[PDB]
Design a protein around this ligand. Structure first.
Ligand SMILES: CC[C@H](C)[C@H](N)C(=O)O
Ligand SMILES: [Zn+2]
Length: 917
């Protein structure tokens, strides 16, 4: 009788063959310009702008890039399917050391050089172009949709002009100022750096305690025979630049029997270390030591005893070796006392002629790198070296050369944080104040991200903008030699900006000063000289809101954006640079909302690097699992924290994907034969039908609410529980007899099919942002779904009203299945017990007599899948709720239910179906 059943099959395959079929889908969306079609949708209602943070145009995509673009894609697709016009122009960060360092390294490896600035910039620009195309196509292989054929590029000439015009706005508001002070200096790239370009890593260091003997006249003033202040330092390379020893104000300093002078609060620690001897002979107040003078044991130079602002007593000695050329707090102390700023370390981190001309350090050190010289310096200290250790400490390194940085007093350009400036509304505020106010108006997901960014703004220094490399946007101002000050005249600045817009920034190197000035100024061209520093690339990316959202007047999205979505490492990076520049231009953040994610890490939670051998390639991952599995893995996991890549976790995701896919296959298979005239007329739905429609509505609200708050785990868990439990476990098991053995003309079967159609419809809508290829495939294989949803393809999906499309009555009282589902669970646990004893094989062999008479007997029979409700003859078991019997019928050879009065004879329902004309 098997061939007399309803076939109930679909062409939608159980196997996804994802690595074969996904490229076909994505190629189609590119060929057909699906993102453009999305933006053009005629019934768009509302707008949604996600502003892409631009990856650097260097190298192939990392797993973190895929995580990022997939999450953006889910968020964007969610808004599209809610009915909005979407703005999502992806972009690329094309300048900076992330590109330039690769060129510098390749030149070195080729044993070649390239000193021509235009030709050098050309090699960098060609490298960004190459990898922009590579990353673009790799992004498209994730199934993401955006304006990838018209992306934004910081190397576009109009973009270079937009960045420069952002800088112009900073300068005209009085926040762009030169400062001279020690800052981060990367000797390996001969450039200043700021915080976002520094990576702190553990590093071993010498750690030394050094005695500076007081001069004879100072010992006479203090009335002791011997006294030497002891300092602690990890940088013997700066001892040549000492000008002072800074003490804590109004603090007691102990003089030992051997003549060492240290903070009394630290004497116990230092004597236990063996730095000084244990016997204290005299105590002195630091206020009485100020303006004594000591002698540097390295070079015999005077060192002033000074009082520092906040000298610490937790480490060291309480006497701080002070080198204004190499320490920012040292520098301010030096100026307060009108001391020399000694700085004889060149741009490559090597001692220069200054050590000879000023007698700071022996001539032999000329040309030596400061880190290389330290062993010989420590040996030169002789008896003044009281103790030498080796320690480990967290130390700043250059983000691209990975070499340790140093600090060098230098003249650079800064955006000031504590300089009051005129607000757009006419009030007066500092940038720090504006940025803190602006942070409070932004929504952070998770909300903990707010305090992370806030704390950085509270604590950050002035922002050094000027870099000494060639690949970037120049700080393209002239210094008037007649004034020694920059020219911020609007006519000059807009003349340069317009040149940049048309020709790009190459002209700043190529053109003469005269050719770069408005005609009104060319007679005075001899008085002007170009600043040749370039902008921090974090200023480039900080300006994307201006260059993309503002300068295209909303065609690429609104300013402020509705959402930005990046790694939580961008609090130190793009979030902060965009926040600061937004606050100068607009006095608010250029984003309304920040969503963050973690890092992709290995099975042990560790970062992937080539030096570790734990790198999983994005290509290998997509080839193994398929992009819809990778996308589901992202969505079905706690992406705000680090995501670990392991076989075990991807296997779990594949099982989820399989369950979703097998469920959609079953639904499609079991309404494939439905007559489409059913779609227009209403149906009489059973209580179980209604229970499922009501359950589907309740869980649909919960999936949607979870997805709205970007908690895709919570929503997918709700969806998966529904498909596993109420759908597959209860409804589809109860309906299989009718779906396969009732007549196609049976109105109860047709009503089940409509429920299955409504259920697949909701599954398609909710999974469309995540498994877009798979839902596209579902629609491709189901004509009934396409008619019912009025959908040509996945991009025509909308959130449908099941009530309206099935013609449900307005005030229908919901079903209450609590009692009958409690019976079902009790029956199934009693039935499990009888299968243990070998008494019966399945529920169909049973009759049940329910002790509660209020229950609907057909629904009991449906849900428990017994063949008979009522009393029979062979008792199997008894509970307080029900008695089970052997069903007093034969098994029907067609439907396998125990409903046949005669052996091997079709039951009454089957007999009619087999007879039907
Ligand atoms: C948001 C990205 C930022 C701007 C930077 N290009 C990076 O890849 O880290
Ligand atoms: Zn039958």
């Amino acid at each position: 009788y098997k061939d007399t059943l309803n076939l109930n099959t679909t062409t939608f395959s159980m196997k996804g063959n994802l690595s074969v079929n996904e490229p076909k889908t994505y190629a189609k969306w590119q060929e057909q310009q699906a993102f453009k079609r999305m933006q053009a949708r005629k019934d768009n209602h509302g707008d949604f702008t996600l502003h892409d943070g631009p990856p650097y145009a260097n190298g192939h995509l990392h797993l973190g890039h895929a995580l990022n673009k997939i999450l953006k894609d889910i968020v964007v697709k969610r808004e599209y399917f809610k009915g909005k016009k979407i703005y999502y122009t992806p972009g690329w960060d094309c300048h900076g050391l992330p590109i330039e360092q690769q060129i510098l390294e390749r030149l070195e490896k080729e044993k070649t050089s390239l000193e021509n600035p235009t030709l050098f910039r050309e090699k960098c620009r060609d490298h960004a172009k190459k990898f922009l195309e590579i990353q673009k196509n790799e992004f498209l292989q994730l199934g993401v949709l955006g304006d990838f054929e018209d992306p934004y590029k910081t190397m576009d000439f109009k973009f270079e002009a937009s960045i420069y015009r952002a800088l112009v706005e900073v300068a005209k508001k009085g926040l762009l100022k030169e400062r001279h002070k020690p800052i981060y200096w990367s000797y390996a790239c001969e450039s200043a750096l700021a915080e976002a370009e520094v990576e702190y890593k553990m590093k071993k260091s010498p750690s030394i305690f050094v005695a500076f003997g007081l001069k004879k006249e100072s010992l006479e003033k203090l009335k002791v025979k011997k006294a030497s202040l002891v300092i602690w330092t990890t940088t013997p390379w700066t001892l040549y630049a000492n000008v002072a020893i800074a003490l804590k104000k109004d603090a007691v300093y102990a003089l030992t029997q051997k003549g060492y002078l240290v903070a009394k609060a630290l004497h116990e620690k230092l004597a236990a270390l063996g730095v000084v001897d244990n016997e204290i002979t005299h105590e002195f107040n630091s206020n009485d030591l100020e303006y004594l003078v000591a002698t540097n044991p390295l070079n015999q130079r005077d060192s002033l005893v000074a009082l520092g602002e906040h000298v610490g007593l937790e480490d060291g000695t309480g006497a701080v070796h002070t080198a204004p050329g190499h320490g920012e707090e040292d520098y301010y102390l030096g100026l307060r006392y009108n001391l020399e700023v000694l700085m004889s370390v060149d741009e490559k981190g090597c001692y220069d002629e200054g050590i000879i001309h000023n007698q700071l350090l022996d001539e032999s050190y000329l040309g030596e790198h400061v880190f290389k010289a330290q062993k010989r310096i420590i040996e030169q200290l002789g008896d003044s070296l009281l103790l030498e250790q080796e320690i480990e400490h967290s130390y700043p390194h250059c983000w691209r050369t990975h070499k340790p940085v140093i600090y060098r007093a230098t003249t650079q350009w800064f955006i000031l944080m504590d300089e009051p400036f005129i607000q757009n509304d006419g009030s007066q505020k500092t940038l720090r104040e504006v940025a803190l106010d602006a942070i409070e108006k932004v929504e952070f997901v998770p909300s903990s991200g707010k305090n992370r960014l806030k704390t950085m703004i509270e604590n950050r220094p002035d922002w050094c903008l000027s870099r000494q490399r060639k690949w970037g946007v120049p700080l393209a101002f002239f210094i008037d030699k007649r004034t020694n000050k920059p020219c911020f005249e609007s006519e000059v600045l807009e003349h340069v900006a317009n040149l940049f817009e048309k020709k790009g920034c190459d002209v700043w190197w190529e053109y003469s000063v005269k050719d770069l000035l408005p005609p009104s100024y060319q007679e005075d061209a001899k008085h002007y000289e170009k600043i040749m520093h370039i902008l921090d690339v974090w200023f480039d990316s900080g300006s994307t809101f201006k260059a993309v959202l503002e300068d295209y007047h909303g065609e690429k999205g609104q300013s402020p954006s509705d959402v930005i979505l990046e790694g939580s490492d961008q609090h130190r990076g793009w979030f902060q640079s965009s926040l600061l520049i937004g606050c100068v231009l607009n006095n608010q953040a250029p984003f309304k909302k920040v969503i963050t994610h973690g890092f992709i890490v290995d099975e042990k939670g560790e970062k992937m690097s080539k030096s570790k051998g734990n790198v999983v390639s994005l290509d290998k991952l997509l080839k193994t699992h398929g992009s819809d599995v990778v996308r589901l893995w992202v969505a079905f996991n706690d992406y705000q924290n680090d995501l670990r890549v392991s076989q075990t976790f991807f296997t779990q995701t594949e099982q989820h994907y399989k369950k979703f896919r097998n469920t959609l296959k079953f639904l499609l298979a079991n309404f494939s034969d439905m007559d489409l005239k059913n779609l227009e007329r209403p149906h009489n739905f059973s209580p179980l039908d209604h229970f499922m429609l009501e359950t589907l509505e309740t869980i649909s609200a919960g999936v949607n609410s979870a997805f709205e708050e970007h908690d895709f785990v919570k929503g997918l868990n709700i969806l998966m529980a529904f498909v596993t439990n109420e759908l597959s476990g209860i409804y589809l098991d109860a309906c299989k007899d009718s779906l396969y053995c009732d007549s196609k003309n049976n109105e109860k079967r047709q009503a089940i099919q409509m429920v299955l159609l409504a259920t697949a419809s909701k599954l398609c809508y909710f999974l469309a942002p995540i498994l877009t290829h798979t839902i596209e495939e579902v629609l491709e294989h189901s004509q009934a779904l396409r008619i019912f949803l009025q959908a040509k393809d996945v991009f025509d999906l909308k959130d449908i009203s099941v009530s309206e499309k099935l013609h449900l009555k307005e005030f229908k009282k919901p079903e209450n299945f609590e009692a009958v589902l409690a019976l079902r669970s009790a029956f199934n646990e009693e039935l499990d017990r009888l299968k243990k004893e070998g008494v019966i094989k399945n529920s169909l062999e049973c009759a049940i007599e329910v002790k509660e008479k209020a229950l609907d007997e057909n629904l009991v029979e449906e849900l428990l899948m017994v063949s008979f409700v009522g009393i029979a003859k062979e008792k199997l078991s008894e509970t307080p709720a029900f008695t089970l019997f052997k069903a007093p019928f034969y098994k029907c050879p067609r439907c396998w239910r125990f409903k046949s009065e005669l052996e091997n004879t079709p039951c009454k329902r089957c007999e009619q179906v087999l007879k039907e004309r």
